[PDB]
Design a protein that fits this description.
The structure is cut from a larger assembly and holds 1 copy of chain A (243 residues), 2 copies of chain B and 2 copies of chain C (547 residues).
Chain A lengths: L8 H10 L13 H8 L21 H5 L4 H5 L3 E8 L8 H11 L4 E4 L4 E6 H13 L8 E3 L24 E3 L6 E5 L5 E7 L6 H7 L14 H19 L1
Antiparallel strand pairs in A: 1-3, 1-4, 2-3, 5-6, 6-7
Chain B lengths: L5 E5 L5 E7 L9 H12 E5 H10 L22 H12 L8 E5 L4 E5 L2 H4 L7 H18 L6 H9 L13 E2 L20 H7 L4 H18 L8 H12 L5 H9 L5 H14 L4 E6 L2 E5 L3 H23 L5 H16 L8 H11 L28 H10 L8 H4 L1 H6 L4 H4 L1 H11 L5
Antiparallel strand pairs in B: 1-2, 3-5, 3-6, 4-5, 7-8
Chain C lengths: L4 H7 L21 H17 L19 E3 L6 E3 L9 H11 L1 E5 L1 H9 L7 H14 L22 E6 L2 H6 L8 H4 L2 H11 L3 E6 L2 H6 L4 H17 L9 H11 L1 E2 L21 H7 L10 H24 L7 H5 L6 H16 L9 H21 L1 H6 L3 H20 L2 H19 L9 H10 L27 H15 L7 H6 L12 H9 L16
Antiparallel strand pairs in C: 1-2, 3-5, 3-6, 4-5
Classes of the chains: A alpha+beta (243), B alpha+beta (442), C mainly alpha (547).
Bound molecules: factor 430, Coenzyme B (TP7), 1-thioethanesulfonic acid (2 copies), magnesium ion (2 copies), sodium ion (NA) and xenon (4 copies).
């Protein structure tokens, strides 16, 4: 699959996120316990609450052909993880996430907004996905944020440390260490022990990995082949609706 | 036949049934089974005899939390259901041995009623089914117990509710699949104002049978709305065949090839391959490491893309066993396939647009609800002309119990009664057989 | 003495029995303080805006007869009829706004979604936290997003959310500021009936701002309510601010467990929810709170409902929504002024009480033919013996409504059944028509002639118990002088029976609330207070306007 | 300088180009004068009523960033966003009331019935006598019957009836107090177009009282109008007060020659006539009177329509009628604050003027692909170069609506056709979505994705010229950030062409009236006046309420 | 011809289209019947009246056997005549929406 047209770094970064054969660059190591703490749906070691009994406990050719994910077999709840991406060269961006999620992950419910992007799926499968979303180049601890509510910041100016605005301040930059610590879960509840999220990517690497077009980076109007395809779809949609 | 297209018909198990069937043999205007499905929906009414008895016994009539103290009537309606149903059928029928059907269910607690077709041959719309059924059972109950003139109005309230003070049958103890004609978003929408939960309930949560029935209802309404007329008729017939009828086993094969490990993106890649394999699309232009695809048959590309859309829904929401992600699948299958190919998505963007609001109005505060409460006459999901609702019926069929407003909560009377008719419960069977029987008359 | 004698003596110098008086020498409109105020105001209006307006010389000259004052029944307040026009009466406008901006929303499905789909606990402590959250958000304030602009708390001071439940122990654990206390508002036997009807259910009574209700329409109420319920559910129970389960609360609040005051109307009289035409007669009887304060006097309870409905249905609904202009003020005041309907109905009550005993009469046509005929003849004879009474209620429609309301309510006092009371209403019309060879206006008895055969019909758009009927019942959809009285006949048998409610116990509880602006326990007393320009309504824009 | 620079400098201490600022140290809600007023008011409100209300400690703490002031575009008025909430802004409420209480009723069929069926004469002198009669009766005063009670003329001082006609001699013969003079209100070339459209027809502009419109609903307007027209026809032309021919006037006034501001809505969004959802985009452009005072600046005319529509459709209609609560104030203020949309649209005008010249471009997809793409890139680049601008219009929906409106209006400036302007609107969305990998809220581009295929469709519920579409167009029925801008795109090609009207010449003339309360020639200026609490609305009850 | 579409006293200046529909009513009505009919031998009837100024259309009964109510008659007739007019004169994509407004009015806004 080609996934997306264009000849800029942005276009290639969008293809890289969508291509399941592209191995996402791992930038940090996060423990399983910290991921469960960041999600905030259950305490580490707490059993998965069930919305319905396990599947083993009707006749359908589709049901027999589509292998369910492990969380659906057990009857786990559908929980979420939600990210906010700064328009100042965050590596991932809202529509890039949803497009990439439905190429890479099974049983995914993705939603795109300007100030947030959410995926809902079975709880134990979300934890496996959230690990990759938090450890890889999908996430930057300064220009990106895990936010279940009060997501204001994607379009705001940065603070003195280069951190994106957060009404609840879930991610704290440490001036002494140069690393970001997550002091609350994505809904804003204080954690017992913060989770180290590593150092923010420098401005050189952000522009190398970002998927947003900007005039002070790579402008969308200069990626003439990408614009041409969007204009082509607009014209073909118009003609199809007429006849 | 107006069109040259022919399709190979398959069953809900991926087995070939009939090869090279003209496209219009599946048309609602020609297929006798689709005619039997549409006419059956118009004339079928469920009567809750137990609910009527409980309403009369408690004087709880006319809407939620409503009661008139002092109006209680203790009538053994369920105990006398045989005599009551026999008297009602005598008033419902036009002549003896016509197609009037009255059957008791649940030991007399329920009643399946099918108003004779002769009443509809001289009627403008479909309201004769509940109105004749309600008044026949009201009269039958009154005659059975000799309810006095001063008490009979409570039997009327117990059966049909607060009508005509309310516009609807508010608090009634009868149910149909269609709603009152006043609630149509527009003329010709009546076959769309059928809740997805209603379809899933009476299909008994079979994915392919729910998908076929939803497509049958949606595309048949496209004929009544005038959308499937002239330049657009072939597009709607092709969409009916490939997306809802498993034409050429395309939906089935796509689901089979991506069922164990596949995603929406993997279903797209296989669908684009199949369209290129079958000559539906061809490389029109080459950009920098990007092939621009074109087609000389937009209606056929739309049908192929619509098949993969249904298959992507079955793969994505089937793996999760939760229907809620169907709004995401309907959106990004179409978003991804446009930048994958350079061709317009299903319904030329209208499925993607419908999915945007459907995602919103099923994950926010401003209205909507669960996927099962939507329908073609909902303001949120009326915009795509028959290509989006069938995927929701397939998704709700795969939901393993994650919905508060499931068909068991909003369509309980439908699941018990309307599923008993074999035409509605397994429509893929009869529509394929009927198309084969008329293949040489098209 | 007859209850209307004092009012008649206040109106005219002659004795009530005198058949002669003098006309044409009263000075026209100059006899009236109110008309004089209007003439001076019309001059100022025309002068300020440069367009002629009120002019007593347009058309025919008002005031060739006595321009009567009216006694508001059950009070000693005497006003000119112009003071009872809904445009000139802020108490009447606020009564409708208080109904229009109210909706009842259950918490039972929502709490089930919280515990099952979200796996979180619901306790009286969480309900209190939610209620404190929703009473901040409901008037129009933020709880989640950053950089939100909000409504001025003083402009929306009348909007709030309360809850009630039949479980006394649960009710005592919720913060009492948010609880409608059934045990404090209703007498013992009524409170036990209502608490038994509600059971373990928890129901919200939501009132949106009057200023919004006046700016928008009735269909806004349930939508405005649902948005702020949904936001407060997100905040109080720590949901993601927009996930899949959030859609359940929206559907629950907008459709699943919501009780509208009025259902929507068909196209010819196109109107959304919470408009007067959608309010059934049973709801209107239950909105009126006379039942819980005058429960020993079923006549007083029934006639307070008549006053509620006559003003709403005839003056605001039929007199403005469906027509407009000068309107139907005196078409309605005939039913709640000068103690005229009171005298007629207290007669029928005593007649029924002595002959049958309340609710002891047979529920058949014999009781209808007896009670309705006796009360009708008594009522019509009062106009024949007191010429000042006949000149007072000068319109035949007025008289037909008052006489038949007494006959209908009295028949319902006898049978304990509203349907035979309705049959007595139409019999009163037929006897009235034959006695005086006249009835109402050109089209008064459309429904009245359809009446007898449709009382006990069971056909599609004909058969309904009176409690379920309303202004959208086909025969009733057009004409003045009926709907408010039908609401009184619906209240009549339940008031005589001692029932806590007529049709919906949740509606009855929803208006037993001291934080309402209009006092629904004293409807006629509120009408008099608004006529005297002493009523303080909500929704004014004075705070955001210059001095 | 960019037109938005001044507003950005007033909002923040930093220069508009700076990418960094400081947060969390502003004191929360204490940074704002308005929030401080709300906190104090909520404390007084809660104490007075005994129920908690506004509480800044509920939910999340507002004010971690700068709580911005907003410049009302084309003015020098700076207010906090709460002052532009429709509940807090009496000018916004009065703008909708002036539309809701207005109806246009022809006199042509009525005059024909008088002369043919009644055999009576109609002259300019009789029309003046009728107009003097109707301006007494329309506010709620009697002309025929004895012992009528009337509305207080001072409470209904805003109700009146005027007439207009294309015949200068007929207009000059009617008393000028009742005449909307087309020659005085419109420039010459516009006046000739309107007078040629009207011809010898005579049309009434009826405005019923604001206090009635707020008490009732929009469907009251045409009924209230018809009642008082019929009574004045009976009085002025000496009919029997109720004969057969009287029925003709009623049907004429209620159906035959009546122009509603809004048509009724289907059941799901059940509403009668004259509600915002029924007002098509072409009517809204003609209601706005910027076209007759700013006819030399097609950008100024188009954006005054955007301001008119964004407030009504998003804040009042979608933000209250269809939802409610805190609402959609800033979803709409993005389109009429800080001169942002002005800067974007003046760019596209000059681009079109320099490259094509206004209305000289081909009406095809080539012009769409060129102008819409160029204007879109300009709009998005301003957010990229001015971080304060991106922090100002922080919501993606806000940005998508502003950018696409400029692209749509500019494309319409080029083609002189609103349908290609609409196609440019949706193209802007597609380019915007791909450039920033984001667009609007969760469900912003439902219509935006359906857009391209439905611009030139011809099918049943898909095909319509943009002037005929409105809030009931199926794709448009739900979502903010479109409807007000669609009205501006409807105005754009006619403003560039110099047309006197967009869709209905009678609607355009009917609001060229200085006796209106709201000044539709300066919509944004009126919004600023209401934000400063200096606007005096109609419909207040102060006269009938205690001090 | 006057761009007066969508209701009383309504007009969109600049949208005018001069088409000789009545002069070609025979070809237009024949083209519409081809789209209205289900088969060549159903009960579809299309007749011109007043020299082509009017057209009597009877939608075939086969469409109503699979319809819930009666709105198929105006909706199928309207779209068939809209498409027939557009095909007859090759009305461009940018102007065709005016033919739709002239035939069916302000629906679906109204
Ligand atoms: C709970 C929801 C989900 C839903 O159905 N509506 C919400 C909330 C609702 C509430 C918020 C009131 C409160 O705070 O109590 C209100 C005011 C509607 C109401 N009930 O009165 C509203 N949104 Ni929302 N909402 C808005 C917006 C937005 C933008 C904000 C993006 C950002 O980065 O700040 C995003 C959608 C997007 O990503 O594009 C958004 C989301 C959301 N919106 C998320 C909450 C997001 C969060 O947790 O912070 N709104 C806007 O884009 C601007 C206008 C603004 C509206 C208020 C106004 O117009 O003045 C408000 C309109
Ligand atoms: C969707 C539909 O609601 P229901 O799903 O029917 O509850 C519809 N409301 C709306 O469209 C809400 C519009 C305003 C809130 C969203 C603004 S983006 C309506 O009430 O008719
Ligand atoms: O004379 S009519 O009875 O038509 C009018 C009654 S208000
Ligand atoms: O977050 S949502 O887009 O659903 C709400 C927008 S106000
Ligand atoms: Mg008081
Ligand atoms: Mg002024
Ligand atoms: Na109102
Ligand atoms: Xe079904
Ligand atoms: Xe859908
Ligand atoms: Xe009572
Ligand atoms: Xe103009």
């Amino acid at each position: 699959a080609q996934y997306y047209p264009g000849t800029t770094k942005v276009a290639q970064n969008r293809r890289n996120f969508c291509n399941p054969e592209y191995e996402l660059e791992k930038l940090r190591e996060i423990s399983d316990e910290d991921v469960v703490k960041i999600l905030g749906h259950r305490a580490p070691g707490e059993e998965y609450p069930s919305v319905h009994p396990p599947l083993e406990e009707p006749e359908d050719a589709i049901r027999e052909m589509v292998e369910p994910i492990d969380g659906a077999k057990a009857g786990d709840r559908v929980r979420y993880i939600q990210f906010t991406d700064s328009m100042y060269f965050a590596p991932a961006q809202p529509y890039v996430r949803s497009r990439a999620y439905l190429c890479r992950y099974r049983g995914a419910d993705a939603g795109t907004l300007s100030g947030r992007q959410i995926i809902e799926t079975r709880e134990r499968d979300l934890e496996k996905i959230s690990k990759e979303l938090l450890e890889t180049e999908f996430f930057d601890p300064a220009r990106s944020g895990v936010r279940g509510k009060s997501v204001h910041g994607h379009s705001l100016r940065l603070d003195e440390d280069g951190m994106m605005f957060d009404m609840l301040r879930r991610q704290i930059y440490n001036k002494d260490t140069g690393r970001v610590e997550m002091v609350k879960n994505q809904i804003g509840d204080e954690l017992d022990e913060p989770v180290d999220l590593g150092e923010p990517l420098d401005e050189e690497t952000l522009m190398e990995k970002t998927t947003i077009y900007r005039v002070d980076g790579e402008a969308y109007r200069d990626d003439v082949e990408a614009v041409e395809i969007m204009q082509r779809i607009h014209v073909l949609r118009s003609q199809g609706g007429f006849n | 036949a107006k069109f040259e297209d022919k399709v190979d018909l398959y069953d809900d198990r991926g087995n070939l049934v009939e090869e090279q069937v003209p496209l219009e043999a599946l048309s609602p205007l020609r297929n006798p089974a689709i005619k039997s499905i549409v006419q059956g929906i118009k004339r079928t009414v469920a009567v809750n005899l137990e609910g009527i008895e409980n309403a009369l016994k408690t004087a709880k009539v006319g809407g939620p939390a409503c009661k008139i103290m002092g109006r209680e009537l203790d009538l053994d309606i369920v105990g006398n259901a045989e005599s009551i149903a026999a008297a009602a059928k005598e008033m419902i029928q036009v002549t003896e041995d016509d197609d009037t059907n009255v059957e008791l269910l649940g030991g007399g607690k329920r009643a399946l009623v099918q108003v004779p077709s002769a009443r509809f041959d001289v009627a403008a719309e479909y309201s004769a089914a509940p109105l004749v059924t309600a008044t026949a059972f009201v009269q039958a109950i009154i005659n059975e117990f000799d309810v006095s003139m001063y008490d009979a109005n409570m039997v009327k309230a117990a059966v049909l509710g607060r009508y005509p003070q309310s516009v609807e049958y508010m608090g009634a103890n009868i149910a149909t699949m269609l709603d009152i004609p006043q609630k149509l978003e527009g003329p010709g929408y009546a076959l769309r104002n059928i809740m997805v939960n209603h379809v899933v309930a009476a299909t008994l949560k079979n994915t392919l049978q729910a998908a076929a029935l939803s497509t049958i209802l949606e595309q048949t309404a496209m004929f009544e709305m005038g959308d499937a007329v002239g330049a657009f008729e072939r597009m709607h017939l092709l969409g009916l065949a490939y997306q809802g009828m498993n034409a050429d086993n395309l939906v089935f094969d796509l689901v089979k090839a991506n069922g164990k490990e596949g995603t929406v993106g993997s279903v797209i890649a296989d669908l684009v391959e199949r369209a290129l394999e079958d000559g539906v699309i061809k490389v029109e232009k080459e950009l920098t490491d990007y092939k621009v695809y074109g087609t000389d048959d937009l209606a056929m590309w739309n049908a192929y893309a619509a098949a993969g859309l249904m298959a992507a829904t079955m793969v994505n929401q089937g793996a999760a066993r939760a229907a809620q992600g169907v709004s995401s699948t309907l959106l990004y299958y179409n978003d991804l396939i446009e930048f994958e190919t350079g061709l317009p998505s299903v319904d030329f963007g209208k499925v993607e647009g419908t999915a945007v609001g459907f995602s919103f109005f099923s994950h926010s505060i401003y209205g909507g609800g669960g996927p099962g409460i939507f329908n073609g006459n909902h303001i949120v999901t009326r915009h795509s002309k028959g290509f989006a609702i069938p995927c929701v019926a397939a998704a709700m069929a795969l939901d393993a119990g994650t919905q508060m407003f499931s068909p068991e909560a909003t369509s309980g009377l439908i699941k018990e009664v309307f599923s008993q008719v074999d035409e509605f419960r397994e429509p893929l069977k009869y529509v394929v057989e009927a198309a084969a029987e008329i293949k040489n008359e098209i | 003495d007859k209850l209307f004698i004092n009012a008649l003596k206040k109106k005219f110098e002659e004795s009530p029995e005198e058949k002669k008086t003098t006309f044409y020498t009263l000075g026209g409109w100059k006899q009236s303080e109110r008309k004089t105020e209007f003439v001076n105001a019309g001059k100022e209006v025309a002068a300020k805006r440069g367009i002629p307006q009120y002019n007593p010389d347009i058309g025919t000259p008002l005031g060739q007869r006595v321009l009567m004052p009216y006694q508001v029944s059950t009070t000693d307040t005497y006003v000119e009829g112009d003071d009872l026009h809904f445009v000139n009466n802020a108490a009447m406008q606020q009564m409708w706004d208080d109904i229009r901006r109210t909706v009842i929303v259950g918490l039972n499905h929502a709490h089930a979604v919280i515990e099952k789909r979200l796996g979180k606990e619901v306790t009286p402590e969480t309900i209190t936290h939610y209620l404190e959250t929703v009473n901040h958000a409901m008037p129009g304030a933020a709880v989640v997003q950053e950089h939100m602009v909000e409504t001025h708390p003083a402009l929306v001071a009348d909007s709030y959310v309360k809850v009630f439940t039949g479980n006394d122990e649960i009710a005592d654990e919720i913060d009492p500021a948010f609880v409608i206390d059934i045990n404090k508002q209703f007498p013992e036997d009524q409170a036990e009936t209502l608490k038994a009807e509600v059971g373990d259910g928890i129901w919200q009574v939501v009132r949106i701002p009057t200023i919004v209700s006046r700016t928008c329409d009735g269909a806004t109420t349930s939508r405005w309510s649902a948005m702020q319920i949904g936001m407060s559910m997100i905040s109080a129970y720590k949901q993601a601010a927009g996930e899949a389960a959030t859609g359940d609360f929206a559907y629950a609040a907008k459709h699943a467990e919501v009780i509208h005051m009025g259902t929507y109307l068909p196209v010819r009289r196109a109107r959304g929810e919470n408009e007067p035409g959608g309010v059934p007669f049973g709801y209107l009887a239950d909105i009126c709170q006379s039942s819980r304060v005058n429960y020993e006097d079923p006549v007083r309870v029934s006639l307070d409902v008549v006053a509620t409905g006559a003003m709403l249905y005839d003056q605001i609904w039929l007199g403005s929504y469906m027509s407009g202009g000068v309107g139907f003020t005196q078409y309605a005041t005939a039913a709640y002024t000068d103690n005229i309907l009171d005298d007629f109905t207290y007669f029928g009550k005593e007649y029924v009480e002595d002959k049958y005993g309340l609710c002891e009469a047979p529920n058949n046509m014999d009781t209808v033919l007896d009670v309705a005929t006796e009360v009708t003849f008594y009522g019509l004879e009062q106009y024949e013996e007191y010429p000042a009474l006949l000149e007072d209620q000068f319109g035949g429609s007025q008289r037909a409504a008052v006489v038949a309301a007494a006959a209908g309510c009295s028949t319902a006092f006898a049978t304990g059944n509203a349907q035979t009371g309705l049959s007595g209403w139409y019999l009163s019309m037929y006897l009235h028509k034959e006695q005086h060879s006249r009835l109402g206006f050109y089209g008064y008895d459309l429904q009245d002639q359809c009446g007898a055969s449709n009382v006990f019909s069971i056909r599609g758009d004909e058969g309904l118990p009176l409690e379920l009927r309303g202004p959208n019942y086909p025969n009733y959809a057009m004409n003045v002088g009926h709907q408010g009285e039908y609401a009184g006949i619906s209240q009549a048998p339940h008031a005589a029976r001692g029932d806590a409610f007529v049709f919906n116990p949740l509606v009855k509880i929803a208006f037993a609330d001291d934080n309402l602006v209009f006092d629904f326990t004293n409807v006629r007393g509120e009408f008099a207070k608004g006529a005297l320009r002493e009523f303080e309504p909500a929704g004014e824009r004075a705070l955001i306007t210059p001095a």
